[PDB]
Design a protein around this ligand. Structure first.
Ligand SMILES: Nc1ncnc2c1ncn2[C@@H]1O[C@H](COP(=O)(O)OP(=O)(O)O)[C@@H](O)[C@H]1O
Ligand SMILES: Nc1ncnc2c1ncn2[C@@H]1O[C@H](COP(=O)(O)OP(=O)(O)O)[C@@H](O)[C@H]1O
Ligand SMILES: Nc1ncnc2c1ncn2[C@@H]1O[C@H](COP(=O)(O)OP(=O)(O)O)[C@@H](O)[C@H]1O
Ligand SMILES: [Mg+2]
Ligand SMILES: [Mg+2]
Ligand SMILES: [Mg+2]
Ligand SMILES: [Mg+2]
Ligand SMILES: [Mg+2]
Lengths: 521, 525, 479, 50, 121, 49, 72
């Protein structure tokens, strides 16, 4: 460079070749590290820490690994941010999109090494992505009028999503549990209303789904435990010293009898408020705040169960399940809309006591009990169940399923090849690289399965070129089977988002040829 | 108050261990060594690369050389290296197979030790199984004939042994060169050879296919004068030891010159003795004299005028090699140089290489010589060393074959037959010692499994198929098809090995296992 | 075990040892969680499950070296686990809760491997009675272990441990003079007995000596009125909870309560109110207008006791409404032996709870292990090759428990295993290792048994942990 | 201290390679050397008996 | 193998160490048992003479980092709190019993049989 | 970074933030240099923007 | 890697992936360092040193540059 220094001491400046080489090396390393967990027969990863009291966890998806590792390469930071955005959006396609981006960058490296302008490569990649999205929009299945076919498609999607994790051994029950939990929402986007309670101990077969609701709280003292018929009512008031105000009042008297009379008046006011609370004719009071001794004994002397310490999520779940309404003030008993329940008791799951709720009217939300050995297995099961619920809600809101496995990628590659075989110029190199990446995307899964990847890829390409646009890959034997008969079906929105994110990341990283680092603090 | 007393010197620095943990650590180290030295077994195995202390690069696959330059510090590893070196010095073929068998036997005995068997009983059972295998291996042995005409079994065995190195593209000619050198230096009246007679020299530059056998003596020197004739058709070798200088006693002598007459007499006697020795060199009838030390100016001029080439600086074994090949005698002085003490030379002509200034003189067309030279040519530095190591291994294999005058069927059938015999003999041993024989039989099948793993097929499935085919028919020549030829019969695939070598390997492995199972203590700083 | 702070702990349970070992490897950091889950679910067999998992993971080395895919190994292991569970269910023995000898044998079987091997005859019947008093043989499906309070006290030996069917307090009393009352009425009080202070910022403005005297006069009058209202109900033993804000008891109130011959115990936490209300049968009182009515109760003898010289202790024996709660008073010289006896009692209670919840009995020792091993060896001959090898490797790992039991007894493990395998394939199937005789005989004659649910859960957890290990094979360091 | 292994079953070599500095423990090495120089057999039996 | 991040023994070394510690603790207060024994002296860092020979006070003001020593000290403290006399004789008897049981343990005898025999005796 | 065919620039912050932009003003501003001429040019670009 | 130490202090060993990766990286670097001087229109390089006597040579042959660089 120039002998006259411009930057400060400790600030580097990578030019066009060094920065591109560093970004390509980082992308290749990220792809090689993330390619181990892609196919259904993948393995697990151990993410141990050294400053956070040695946090041990076991994950399978690449998003958690990318969020827990945290490197310093900006080319890898872009992919990490893209994976995090995709996880926050849909949460099912991170390893696939990052592998596609790594393959695109690896192809762009060899393209630049062949003395090719980056603008032509960007234009070819944009044209290939447009052709792929057009082919994907043209080849789509719309199911919404039929109910049995829609349920079968949902079950197949849930099974294909759960088979990629550690739930392949109990997929015969977890898929049905997720299907039953999804239908309880009545077609709503209330994914946070489904509570997942994980308890240590027991096998995976004991993870049963309760049709009612479960609460890990404790009722008051001197109160009946089980109730034959009750009416739950949710309140939002403060029974522990109701005097929280901004009023700067003070007692300026001159006798202890006056203070005693003031205390007696406060106790009488509290008793009147408690009586007005029970004026609605209820018998199962639930408060979101704390309950002292006087209201507890007042509710116990009348034979009314009082439950304290309730969060906002539990209150919302109880209001959505029992159909109640959060009321306060307690002055209009004609407008309150109480709940309805015909079964209240306490069960013993493991070594703790939880209130069992059953016989509700609505029941939009539901609790899921998870039983496992270690904490890592339970965390992985909870993450897989959450991802399955998310993808099920997504494919329900979309109401359109597309056969996955490897047919969509081959169709997109064939469309890109057909588009490139009509236009001249140097734009055919970028389309050729895109088709090669789309054909190599299932090759990683074929190699991770343990069969001949090249022969299967060639057979799939021949089947897609001969006129059969329904073939795919069989994981139970290693041959070529029909995707519409086995049950390998994914989603359209997830694949479209993955393709668009990969194209955007490729266009962003390819348009970078300078890195100016500042002085570290 | 129990005050600690000082017993051993520097007790606050050394460490003492019990015994079970030490045995477990030794077994784990042996297993790790066997796993590391496992890929270099079979024709499909690759080569290794080592780095010296200064910065030299050495690539080979002999096994003993890889372990000798490994630089370890765990005693057991040094013991394995010493065992491999002793095996290479005794037999020469199979340096890593013995340590692999020892590691497999130790891994198999680890289970019996963890179960609850005394190590002495395990060692006794292993020794009994090794003795049974040795006694059974000599039953399926076949004797071959050795003659100067039929050299087919030796060539086949040399091709089979040299079928795993990188010089396999030319081992077809290397085997013939080795068998020719063996037939030249055979010495059948005493059943022994001499490695000091065979000169193995190599040089960079050229091709690998340029390796040929020379029935003479080659040197790395040139002529004393550039104007001397290079090539000759009929010359006699005159080996000499005294230099071309005037005689000088080794004692303390003092010459006193007190007049011009003494100086003139000395100056005359110098040239007189020079002319006398020059005429004596010529009167013997020889045409090419060979000295040892340097020459001079007047002597070189007289030799050039009298037309007589000579070679300087040959004080090494070159004089002995020339005297053995040409058959000429060695004289200490010039007065004893007779016509009967001269060697017959056929073709003495130097050769030129590339653009360098290196010239080497080679003699050929000799009589019934007992020493030959092996010229190695290549394009790399490690290639010459690998070729020399392969030639030495082939020579050792042929020497062992001549000493044993019988061969066997190896590859992947001898070990299977030995394991089957051990398992059959273990059925009639109900005195608790049946657990060691089964372990020895299970550990003996580690060679076919490793071969099938290095090839690229199912190890256990191929081993079970070979065992079934051997127990169904009656032919102990069914190994593992590593070259993918179709038939699994090793009798038609020209796979010939050694018997005494395998017996010594088994005995050494059993002895090392018994010695390791006895040690159960360590006291290192 | 010695920690970094200097605490020396001596325990025999495998779960506690694994928790106090503090490992750093994930393969070792999963075993502690496995043992914790096993102790939470069942309670016993925390060391057998770890031994089985280690034996399986060690036998998996041969299958990994031979070249077998981990999915096939996991499927074969799941099939073997299902077969073993089916065999254990078919070989289960029915048992009811009416047989008192079976419960005593099951309680004394888990009290011979620790330091309480010489005092099991006194801890097993006491634990059996404590279990029978809490639960009911009506239709109880589980045993609530939270209703039993363990009281530890230093002093004496282990044979001095008894069982009190009442409320036992560790603190003393706040009254001097009256420490033994025959007929007393316990009354729970949750309100303070001090100066009247409202929740708001209250203050008294005094500008004359008349008001200065009137304030104290009114305070004394209010204290006397409260004392008379408390004495009007006819109470003798008062229980005041802990108050962090205002004072729960003053000097004048304490003097008046002592003059009224009322015992004051102002040392009750906010976490043992439900236990006391369920044991002595009372109701919490927070207002002075309710302590006069039905909120009272009755009891029998409630007097404190004194030890040899290590503090006082309260004992309330005899109540009008007996509940379903009980407490155990564990004694001992050293604290290590006290915690050891407490852990042994907890393990016995967990074993009894598991036996009640399962209602299934099986022979102890090493008979089920060798039986399952023989059944798996006789089953591998009906499969293919890889499945047969996997089943054989799974069956060979079950011979570690009998070998360890034979080695710890002082005999030859290989000969004992051979004899147990030869005797289990000729008629009898309930033969185990006897540490008293020194050979192989019928294990059902030594009055030693073990529950089936504990072993089933241990085997299931071990199989799950083994299947979860083969799925992981990468260690990446994070921040 | 140089890195050479010394494997020997005889107690005399073990006592010689131990290098004991205790004034009272040197009595066993002396009698062991005396027994080895006299007949050379029971070198550990005398130490066990002592 | 087995990452414990600390130090551990084997089987007989810990027993020998405990026996030696018990013997040292017994010999510490073995000159003030009978009526003909003399008293001891305990001096701290600031210079405070403590002339006593009851045994319990000497064991309490000793500060030993050994588990067996702390066990013997707490046993003597419990004996002095429950009774007050005979604080050193019990420790000496326990040390002698441990020394006698060590010889039986070294003779390939299970500790359970020795414990049962001690309890019966 | 001038024209339709110009590529973008990747800037690295002090804390570790990545900012890829094409505007020359922000690029010159986020470069914490030390020469007086570079600072004058950065100020000129800021005033122009 | 095995927890039991085998090699001496200050000796590394690459297995199969890392060794092949390093070898390929070194080969690519060696091939790219001399690739600029291959065609007929190639340029020259500068081979300066500091340990000798400040020798400065400019040549176009690849063998001379490879011998003067001193790779590791
Ligand atoms: N049963 C199956 N058969 C074939 N392919 C499958 C199956 N299950 C999942 N896949 C493949 O796995 C891929 C998704 O794997 P996963 O790692 O769970 O999510 P991501 O898309 O984030 O990588 C999909 O592209 C799909 O082709
Ligand atoms: N052509 C062949 N056919 C059958 N077996 C072979 C063949 N070549 C080598 N082997 C086997 O491979 C093993 C390794 O031989 P090699 O690598 O040449 O030397 P080393 O025994 O020193 O490793 C030998 O034991 C031999 O049995
Ligand atoms: N008296 C006995 N007779 C036969 N077997 C016994 C006896 N006591 C214990 N065992 C066996 O020893 C094994 C270990 O028991 P123990 O160490 O007490 O608890 P854990 O099973 O938690 O390790 C049990 O599986 C049991 O079968
Ligand atoms: Mg996914
Ligand atoms: Mg060889
Ligand atoms: Mg137990
Ligand atoms: Mg002797
Ligand atoms: Mg006394």
């Amino acid at each position: 460079l120039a002998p006259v220094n411009i930057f400060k001491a400790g600030a580097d400046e990578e030019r066009a070749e060094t920065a591109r080489l560093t970004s390509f090396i980082g992308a290749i390393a990220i792809g090689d590290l993330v390619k181990s967990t892609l196919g259904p027969k993948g393995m697990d990863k151990i993410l141990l820490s050294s400053g956070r009291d040695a946090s041990l966890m076991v994950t399978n998806d690449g998003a958690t690994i990318l969020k827990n590792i945290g490197v310093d390469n900006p080319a890898a930071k872009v992919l990490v941010d893209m994976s995090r955005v995709q996880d926050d959006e849909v949460g099912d396609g991170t390893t696939s999109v990052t592998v596609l981006a790594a393959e695109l960058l690896r192809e762009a490296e060899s393209l630049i090494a062949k003395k090719i302008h980056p603008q032509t490569i960007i234009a070819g990649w944009r044209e290939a992505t447009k052709a792929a999205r057009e082919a994907l929009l043209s080849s789509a299945v719309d199911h919404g009028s039929d109910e049995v076919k829609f349920r079968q498609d949902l079950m197949n999607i849930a099974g294909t999503t759960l088979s990629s994790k550690l739930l392949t051994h109990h997929k015969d029950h977890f898929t049905k549990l997720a299907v039953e939990a999804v239908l309880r929402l009545k077609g709503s986007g209330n994914l946070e209303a489904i509570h997942i309670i994980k308890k240590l101990g027991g096998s995976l077969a004991d993870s049963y789904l309760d049709e009612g609701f479960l609460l890990d709280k404790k009722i008051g003292v001197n109160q009946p435990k089980r109730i034959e018929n009750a009416k739950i009512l949710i309140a939002n008031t403060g029974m522990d010293t109701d005097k929280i105000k901004i009023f700067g009042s003070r007692v300026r008297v001159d006798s202890t009898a006056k203070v005693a009379e003031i205390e007696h008046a406060e106790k009488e006011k509290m008793k009147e408020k408690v009586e007005r609370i029970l004026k609605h004719g209820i018998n199962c009071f639930i408060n979101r705040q704390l309950i002292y001794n006087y209201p507890e004994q007042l509710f116990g002397a009348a034979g009314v169960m009082a439950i304290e310490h309730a969060d906002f999520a539990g209150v919302e779940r109880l209001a959505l399940v029992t159909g109640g309404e959060i009321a306060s003030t307690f002055d209009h008993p004609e407008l309150v809309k109480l709940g309805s329940c015909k079964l209240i008791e306490e069960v013993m799951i493991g070594e703790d006591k939880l209130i069992h709720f059953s016989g509700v009217a609505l029941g939009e939300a539901c609790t899921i009990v998870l039983r496992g050995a270690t904490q890592q297995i339970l965390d992985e099961a909870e993450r897989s169940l959450h991802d399955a619920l998310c993808v099920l809600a997504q494919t329900v809101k979309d109401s359109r399923t597309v056969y996955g496995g490897g047919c969509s990628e081959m169709l997109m590659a064939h469309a890109v090849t057909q588009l490139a075989n009509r236009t001249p110029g140097k734009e055919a190199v970028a389309m050729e690289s895109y088709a090669k990446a789309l054909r190599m995307l299932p090759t990683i899964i074929a190699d991770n399965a343990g069969y001949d990847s090249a022969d299967l890829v060639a057979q799939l390409r021949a089947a897609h070129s001969e006129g059969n646009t329904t073939a795919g890959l069989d994981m139970r034997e290693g041959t070529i089977g029909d995707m519409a008969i086995l049950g390998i079906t994914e989603s359209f929105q997830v694949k479209r988002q993955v393709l668009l994110s990969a194209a955007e990341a490729a266009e962003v990283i390819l348009r970078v040829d300078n890195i100016i680092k500042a002085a570290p603090r | 108050y129990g005050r600690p007393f000082l017993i051993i010197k520097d007790q606050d620095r050394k460490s003492r261990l019990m015994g079970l943990e030490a045995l477990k650590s030794h077994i784990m180290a042996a297993k790790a060594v066997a796993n590391t030295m496992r890929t270099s077994l079979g024709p499909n195995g690759l080569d290794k690369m080592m780095v010296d202390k200064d910065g030299d690069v050495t690539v080979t696959n002999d096994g003993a050389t890889i372990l000798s330059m490994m630089d370890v510090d765990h005693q057991i590893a040094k013991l394995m290296v010493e065992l491999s070196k002793s095996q290479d010095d005794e037999i020469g073929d199979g340096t890593t197979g013995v340590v692999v068998l020892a590691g497999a036997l130790l891994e198999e005995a680890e289970q019996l030790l963890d179960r609850g068997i005394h190590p002495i009983r395990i060692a006794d059972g292993y020794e009994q199984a090794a003795r049974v295998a040795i006694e059974h291996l000599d039953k399926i042995s076949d004797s071959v004939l050795v003659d100067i005409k039929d050299t087919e079994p030796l060539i086949q065995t040399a091709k089979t042994t040299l079928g795993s190195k990188v010089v396999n593209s030319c081992h077809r000619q290397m085997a013939e060169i080795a068998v020719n050198a063996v037939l030249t230096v055979a010495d059948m009246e005493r059943r022994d050879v001499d490695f000091e007679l065979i000169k193995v020299e190599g040089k960079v530059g050229g091709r690998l296919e340029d390796t040929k056998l020379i029935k003479g003596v080659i040197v790395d020197k040139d002529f004393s004068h550039p104007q001397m004739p290079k090539k000759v058709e009929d010359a006699k070798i005159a080996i000499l030891t005294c230099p071309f200088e005037p005689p000088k006693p080794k004692t303390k002598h003092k010459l006193d010159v007190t007049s011009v007459e003494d100086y003139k007499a000395l100056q005359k006697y110098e040239k007189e003795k020079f002319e006398e020795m020059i005429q004596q060199i010529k009167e013997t009838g020889a045409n090419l004299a060979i000295c040892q030390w340097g020459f001079d100016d007047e002597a070189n001029h007289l030799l050039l005028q009298n037309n007589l080439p000579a070679v300087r600086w040959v004080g090494g074994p070159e004089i002995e090699l020339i005297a053995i090949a040409t058959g000429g005698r060695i004289v200490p002085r010039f007065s004893e140089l007779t016509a009967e003490k001269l060697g017959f030379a056929g073709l003495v002509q130097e050769i030129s290489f590339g653009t360098t200034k290196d010239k080497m003189l080679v003699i050929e067309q000799c009589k019934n010589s007992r020493a030959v030279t092996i010229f190695i040519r290549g394009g790399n530095k490690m290639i010459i060393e690998e070729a020399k190591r392969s030639l030495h291994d082939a020579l050792c294999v042929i020497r062992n074959l001549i000493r044993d005058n019988r061969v066997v069927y190896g590859g992947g059938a001898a070990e299977i037959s030995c394991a089957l015999a051990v398992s059959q003999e273990a059925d009639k041993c109900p005195t608790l010692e049946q657990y060691a024989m089964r372990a020895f039989a299970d550990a003996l099948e580690v060679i076919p499994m490793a071969l099938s793993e290095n090839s690229g097929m199912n190890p256990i499935q191929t081993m079970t198929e070979v065992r079934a085919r051997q127990v169904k028919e009656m032919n102990p020549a069914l190994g593992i098809d590593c070259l993918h030829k179709g038939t699994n019969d090793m009798k038609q695939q020209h796979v010939i090995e050694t018997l005494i070598g395998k017996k010594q390997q088994i005995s050494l492995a059993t002895q090392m296992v018994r010695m390791i199972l006895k040690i159960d203590d360590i006291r290192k700083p | 075990i010695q920690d970094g702070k200097g605490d020396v702990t001596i325990t025999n349970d495998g779960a506690t040892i694994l928790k106090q070992m503090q490992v750093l490897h994930p393969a070792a950091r999963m075993l502690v969680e496995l043992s914790k889950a096993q102790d939470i679910e069942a309670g016993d067999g925390t060391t057998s499950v770890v031994i089985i998992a280690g034996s399986l993971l060690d036998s998996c080395t041969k299958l990994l070296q031979k070249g077998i895919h981990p999915t096939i190994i996991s499927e074969s292991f799941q099939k073997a686990l299902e077969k073993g569970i089916e065999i254990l269910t078919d070989m289960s023995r029915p048992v009811e809760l009416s047989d008192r000898e079976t419960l005593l044998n099951s309680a004394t079987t888990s009290l011979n491997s620790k330091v309480v091997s010489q005092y099991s005859s006194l801890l097993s019947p006491m634990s059996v009675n404590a279990v029978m008093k809490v639960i009911d043989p009506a239709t109880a499906t589980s045993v609530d272990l939270r209703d039993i309070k363990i009281v530890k006290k230093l002093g004496g030996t282990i044979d001095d441990c008894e069982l009190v069917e009442g409320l036992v307090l560790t603190q003393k009393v706040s009254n001097s003079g009256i420490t033994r009352v025959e007929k007393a009425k316990i009354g729970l009080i949750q309100f303070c007995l001090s100066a009247p202070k409202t929740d708001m910022d209250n203050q008294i403005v005094v500008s004359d000596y008349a008001q200065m005297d009137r304030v104290l006069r009114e305070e004394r009058a209010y204290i006397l009125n409260l004392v008379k209202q408390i004495k009007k109900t006819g109470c003798n033993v008062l229980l005041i909870q802990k108050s962090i804000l205002r004072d729960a008891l003053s000097d004048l109130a304490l003097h008046f309560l002592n003059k009224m011959k009322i015992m004051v115990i102002k040392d009750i936490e906010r976490e043992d109110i439900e236990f006391i209300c369920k044991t002595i049968g009372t109701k919490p009182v927070a207002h002075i207008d309710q302590f006069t009515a039905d909120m009272l109760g009755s009891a029998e003898l409630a007097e404190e006791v004194n030890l040899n010289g290590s503090g006082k202790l309260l004992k309330i024996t005899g109540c009008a409404s007996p509940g379903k709660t009980v407490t155990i008073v564990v004694r001992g010289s050293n604290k290590l032996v006290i915690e050891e006896a407490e852990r042994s009692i907890h393990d016995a209670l967990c074993v009894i709870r598991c036996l009640v919840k399962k209602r299934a009995l099986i022979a102890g020792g090493g008979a089920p292990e060798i039986e399952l091993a023989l059944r798996l060896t006789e089953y591998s001959r009906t499969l293919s090759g890889m499945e047969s090898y996997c089943v054989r490797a799974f069956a060979d790992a079950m011979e570690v428990i009998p070998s360890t039991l034979a080695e710890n007894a002082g005999l030859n493990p290989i000969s004992t295993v051979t004899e147990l395998r030869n005797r289990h394939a000729q008629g009898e199937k309930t033969a185990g290792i006897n540490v008293r005789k020194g050979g192989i005989s019928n294990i059902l004659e030594e009055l030693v048994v073990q529950p089936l649910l504990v072993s089933v859960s241990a085997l299931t957890l071990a199989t799950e942990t083994v299947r979860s290990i083969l799925k992981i094979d990468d260690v990446v360091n994070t921040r | 201290g140089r890195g050479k292994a010394t494997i020997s079953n005889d107690g005399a070599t073990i006592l010689k390679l131990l290098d004991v500095v205790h004034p009272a423990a040197k009595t066993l090495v002396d009698i062991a050397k005396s027994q080895d120089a006299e007949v050379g057999d029971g070198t550990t039996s005398v130490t066990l008996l002592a | 193998p087995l990452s414990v991040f600390g130090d551990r023994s084997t089987g007989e070394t810990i027993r020998s160490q405990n026996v030696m510690a018990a013997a040292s603790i017994a010999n510490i207060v073995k000159s003030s048992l009978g009526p003909v024994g003399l008293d001891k002296m305990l001096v701290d860092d600031i210079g405070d003479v403590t002339i006593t020979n009851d045994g319990a006070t000497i064991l309490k003001l000793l500060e030993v980092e050994h588990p067996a020593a702390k066990v013997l000290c707490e046993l003597a403290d419990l004996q002095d709190k429950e009774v007050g006399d005979g604080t050193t004789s019990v420790v000496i008897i326990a040390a002698e019993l441990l020394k006698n049981a060590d010889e039986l343990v070294k003779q390939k005898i299970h500790p359970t049989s020795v414990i049962s025999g001690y309890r019966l005796a």
